[PDB]
Amino acid sequence: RTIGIIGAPFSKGQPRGGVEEGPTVLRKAGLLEKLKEQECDVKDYGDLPFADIPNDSPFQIVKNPRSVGKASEQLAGKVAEVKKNGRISLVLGGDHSLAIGSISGHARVHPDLGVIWVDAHTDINTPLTTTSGNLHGQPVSFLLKELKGKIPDVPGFSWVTPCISAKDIVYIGLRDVDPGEHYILKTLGIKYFSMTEVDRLGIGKVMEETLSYLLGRKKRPIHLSFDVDGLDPSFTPATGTPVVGGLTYREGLYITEEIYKTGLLSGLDIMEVNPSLGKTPEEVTRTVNTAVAITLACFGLAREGNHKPIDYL
Amino acid sequence: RTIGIIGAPFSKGQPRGGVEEGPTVLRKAGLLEKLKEQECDVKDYGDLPFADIPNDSPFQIVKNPRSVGKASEQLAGKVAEVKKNGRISLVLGGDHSLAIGSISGHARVHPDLGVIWVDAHTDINTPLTTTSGNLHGQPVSFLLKELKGKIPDVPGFSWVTPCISAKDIVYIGLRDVDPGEHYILKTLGIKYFSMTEVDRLGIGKVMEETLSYLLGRKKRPIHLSFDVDGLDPSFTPATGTPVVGGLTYREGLYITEEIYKTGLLSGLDIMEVNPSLGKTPEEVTRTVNTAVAITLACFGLAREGNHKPIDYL
Amino acid sequence: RTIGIIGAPFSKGQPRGGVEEGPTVLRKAGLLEKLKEQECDVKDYGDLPFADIPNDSPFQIVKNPRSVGKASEQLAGKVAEVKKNGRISLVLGGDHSLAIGSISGHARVHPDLGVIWVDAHTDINTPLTTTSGNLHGQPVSFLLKELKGKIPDVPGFSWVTPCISAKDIVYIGLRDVDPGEHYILKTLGIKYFSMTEVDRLGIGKVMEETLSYLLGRKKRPIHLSFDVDGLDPSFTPATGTPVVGGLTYREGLYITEEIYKTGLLSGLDIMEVNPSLGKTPEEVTRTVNTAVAITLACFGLAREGNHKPIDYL
Ligand SMILES: N[C@@H](CCCC[C@@H]1CO1)C(=O)O
Ligand SMILES: N[C@@H](CCCC[C@@H]1CO1)C(=O)O
Ligand SMILES: N[C@@H](CCCC[C@@H]1CO1)C(=O)O
Ligand SMILES: [Mn+2]
Ligand SMILES: [Mn+2]
Ligand SMILES: [Mn+2]
Ligand SMILES: [Mn+2]
Ligand SMILES: [Mn+2]
Ligand SMILES: [Mn+2]
Numbered sequence A, B, C: 001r002t003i004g005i006i007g008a009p010f011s012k013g014q015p016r017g018g019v020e021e022g023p024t025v026l027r028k029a030g031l032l033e034k035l036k037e038q039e040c041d042v043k044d045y046g047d048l049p050f051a052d053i054p055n056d057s058p059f060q061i062v063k064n065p066r067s068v069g070k071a072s073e074q075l076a077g078k079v080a081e082v083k084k085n086g087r088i089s090l091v092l093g094g095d096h097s098l099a100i101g102s103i104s105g106h107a108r109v110h111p112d113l114g115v116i117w118v119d120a121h122t123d124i125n126t127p128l129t130t131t132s133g134n135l136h137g138q139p140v141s142f143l144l145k146e147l148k149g150k151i152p153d154v155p156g157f158s159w160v161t162p163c164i165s166a167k168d169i170v171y172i173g174l175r176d177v178d179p180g181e182h183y184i185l186k187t188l189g190i191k192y193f194s195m196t197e198v199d200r201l202g203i204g205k206v207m208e209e210t211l212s213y214l215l216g217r218k219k220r221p222i223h224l225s226f227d228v229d230g231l232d233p234s235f236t237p238a239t240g241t242p243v244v245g246g247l248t249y250r251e252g253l254y255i256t257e258e259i260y261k262t263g264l265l266s267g268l269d270i271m272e273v274n275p276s277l278g279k280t281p282e283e284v285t286r287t288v289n290t291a292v293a294i295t296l297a298c299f300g301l302a303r304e305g306n307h308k309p310i311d312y313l
Helices: A018-027 A031-036 A066-085 A094-110 A137-145 A179-190 A194-202 A203-215 A251-261 A283-300 B015-028 B033-038 B066-086 B096-109 B139-143 B179-188 B196-201 B202-215 B250-263 B279-296 C019-027 C031-036 C065-084 C094-109 C139-143 C178-187 C195-200 C202-214 C249-262 C281-296
Strands: A003-007 A042-045 A086-094 A114-118 A171-172 A190-195 A222-227 A264-273 B001-005 B041-047 B088-092 B113-119 B169-174 B192-195 B221-229 B263-273 C002-007 C041-047 C088-092 C114-118 C171-176 C191-194 C220-225 C265-273
Touching: A003 A031, A003 A066, A018 A031, A018 A086, A018 A264, A018 A283, A031 A042, A031 A283, A031 B179, A042 A066, A066 A086, A066 A094, A066 A264, A066 C065, A086 B279, A094 A137, A094 A222, A094 A251, A094 A264, A094 B202, A114 A203, A137 A203, A137 C265, A171 A194, A171 A203, A190 A194, A190 A203, A190 B066, A194 A203, A194 B202, A194 B250, A203 A251, A203 B041, A203 C195, A222 A251, A251 A264, A251 C031, A264 A283, A264 B066, B001 B015, B001 B066, B001 B221, B015 B088, B015 B279, B033 B041, B041 C202, B066 B096, B066 B263, B088 B202, B088 C031, B096 B139, B096 B221, B096 B263, B113 B179, B113 B202, B113 B250, B169 B196, B169 B202, B179 C002, B192 B196, B192 B202, B192 C171, B196 B202, B196 C202, B250 B263, B250 B279, B250 C249, B263 B279, C002 C019, C002 C031, C002 C065, C019 C031, C019 C088, C019 C265, C019 C281, C041 C065, C065 C088, C065 C114, C065 C265, C088 C094, C094 C114, C094 C139, C094 C220, C114 C202, C114 C249, C139 C265, C171 C195, C191 C202, C195 C202, C220 C249, C249 C265, C249 C281, C265 C281
Parallel strands: A003 A042, A003 A086, A086 A264, A114 A171, A114 A222, A171 A190, A222 A264, B001 B041, B001 B088, B088 B263, B113 B169, B113 B221, B169 B192, B221 B263, C002 C041, C002 C088, C088 C265, C114 C171, C114 C220, C171 C191, C220 C265
Antiparallel strands: none
């Protein structure tokens, strides 16, 4: 498809800094070229320059609110631009707090978007339910219209406007959900397939239901926010908050291959890849290679093979 | 639920001794605290003191019959006690020969119990069919009423009374079954899901059929005897008789999460964890961590999340 | 069943030479004995002596055409012999180019054979579509009647006669298919289950459809060409062209256990095991052990257990 690459070297949504290297190691893995090696029209909007905000004391327990709120605000504008250019936005990021700006900017051009969130976590803590204060675990709370009222005025986010309903999002891969988050899950009726549902139904049925659930009433643009820690750490170890028992490399590709086939992918986030956290050089390459593979699947690379519309014989 | 912890540091059901450390490393992993950290009422009945039986020569090929028969006899009494106290017995053990006493004592208070046996092995060899002579591979033969007649008078087990029928037990995870054992399997019509059935049906259907098979006619207490070598050695390597191609960490949790949801768990055995057999310190922690995870799942810990009955928002 | 072992220490179908050691390390793993330890009548036709062909320059891009064409020609004769002796041919090989002779010789005695090809690749490149020139990636193109016309007169293969139709073959495990190969796939209507279909349907349904697809109209002899790189490299690392995201050890055994149960297995190839490519001594033993396990499954070894027709009690 027509892609618009946007690097988001940001890490203040959490404590470990190496995550802002995500765009670099991914590009250095030949991501742009690989995409071009397919049927992809690729334009790199470069890495966004996230100005330093020296004065950013916590808002209550919440950390680096101004820099996070600013990075998402900046990212939101960029995504809206690439979307206005008729391209699928590919946000190579740092931490997942950036999802706030990516989904926000996407919904400005396509307010009817549906979101598929692959993650070991729900990232739906509010500034009042979070125990860690890390904003990469709160993005979803800022985007949900139903949680509009339980989100205090946090410095840096006054530009935010909830753009999606609890019913326009589906979670896949959950295995470490906080108590308040689970409460929000059940209270708002959010559709999710934790690792338990994946085990019960199999990833094939999981994807069937996910797409049917989001595209049933009518076809609508799809936003895929892929947190690499959604996959098992044996595949993506170089990430900040790994949790054992994750989705397999195969399941990761199955998810993306199916989304690609809908022809409705319009926004994509590949987040939380932190090279600095690899215990070895191999753990880093393994994490980056897996991250690239998932990305390519979103844009056509199929395991059964691919061929141009010509007579090869 | 209401739990009654009972440590069973015993190893004479087999050759390698480190298995009697099971209760120690598990407790030292914070098992009691972790359970309390949930909605669990926990009372530790301590570790049973298994007196040394210096004079215990083999009965034919069978090894350490008196100490094994004695340990199970002692364990049987303890379990019956905790069951009489309205608690779910949690037997942290050494080798699986202890299942004889755990299931025996359980059935004294709840004669209508159904058993789910997760294991790479059937542990149903008789003193006459066993080739190794290790009693941890014969527990089931002593408990089955139908095998009453093919079990010789082995020193230390005169207190035993078969308490379950071949139809009140279901095996899950089998992948190394001896010839005589397989014969007993097919001859008594025992329900089992070897790794082949798990591969064919998927763990979801496997659990559906298992519970339906055992709880169909009527709801009855459930005894789960979990041999950690039922899971693949990439998850539980620190165990005496590992067999490749086992159940996954995910499947292990799926099994237990489903059993928990029945609200019928009344007896649980977490066996065969041998710290001494870990090739590295990490293999030990990996085995113990997995063993703890499975245990917590049996008592409520869910991958989709958990929350108290309060308004978190 | 009645087996006829034939070693094929050949490697010129590709660049790395250690693959010709396949027969050796497999035999040294106790394969013959293990088979005999079952209900198998085993006769080893020894290792075929593949005379050196010093003068063998490439035919266009195709490498070592004369030695490859000769090795398959020799192998074809041997297989036909063992098949004429009422035995299931077990070809312990080097590279997969040998499939040309194995399937050719098999079809001479049983022209109605159906083929199950487990592989990460389709190995259906023609001498004109191949980019590497390695013949181990072209065997299928020489065997298909429908591709009769797109296969130039390559030195060493004038003895070849396409013996199977595109509809008498099923692929399982595909995850690295070239563009021209994919074109041939879709153009000839070849049935395949890439890793994507395995993920979607589960290996149980995959095998159900495969057998139904090949044995539907009528029961016919089965030829299983098993490329060990079809399984994930975490199980069979010592192989020339490994591809991540492969079939599991369990799936590998499920496939073979199901084929065995049809009672129609008549030809088997266990290919691409290259001991020289193991990064460690353990990677070699792990590859060989897995290869032996799959082989034993093809001839009866079942994970649920096995027993002779006698009264064990
Ligand atoms: N729920 C935990 C863990 C958050 C993980 C967030 C990562 C981005 O995906 C917290 O709120 O801190
Ligand atoms: N069937 C073999 C292996 C027994 C394994 C027993 C382990 C407890 O689970 C024997 O009888 O010695
Ligand atoms: N398709 C590639 C890779 C071939 C792999 C062949 C291995 C035998 O299974 C080629 O034609 O060279
Ligand atoms: Mn996460
Ligand atoms: Mn996340
Ligand atoms: Mn066992
Ligand atoms: Mn056991
Ligand atoms: Mn291959
Ligand atoms: Mn091959």
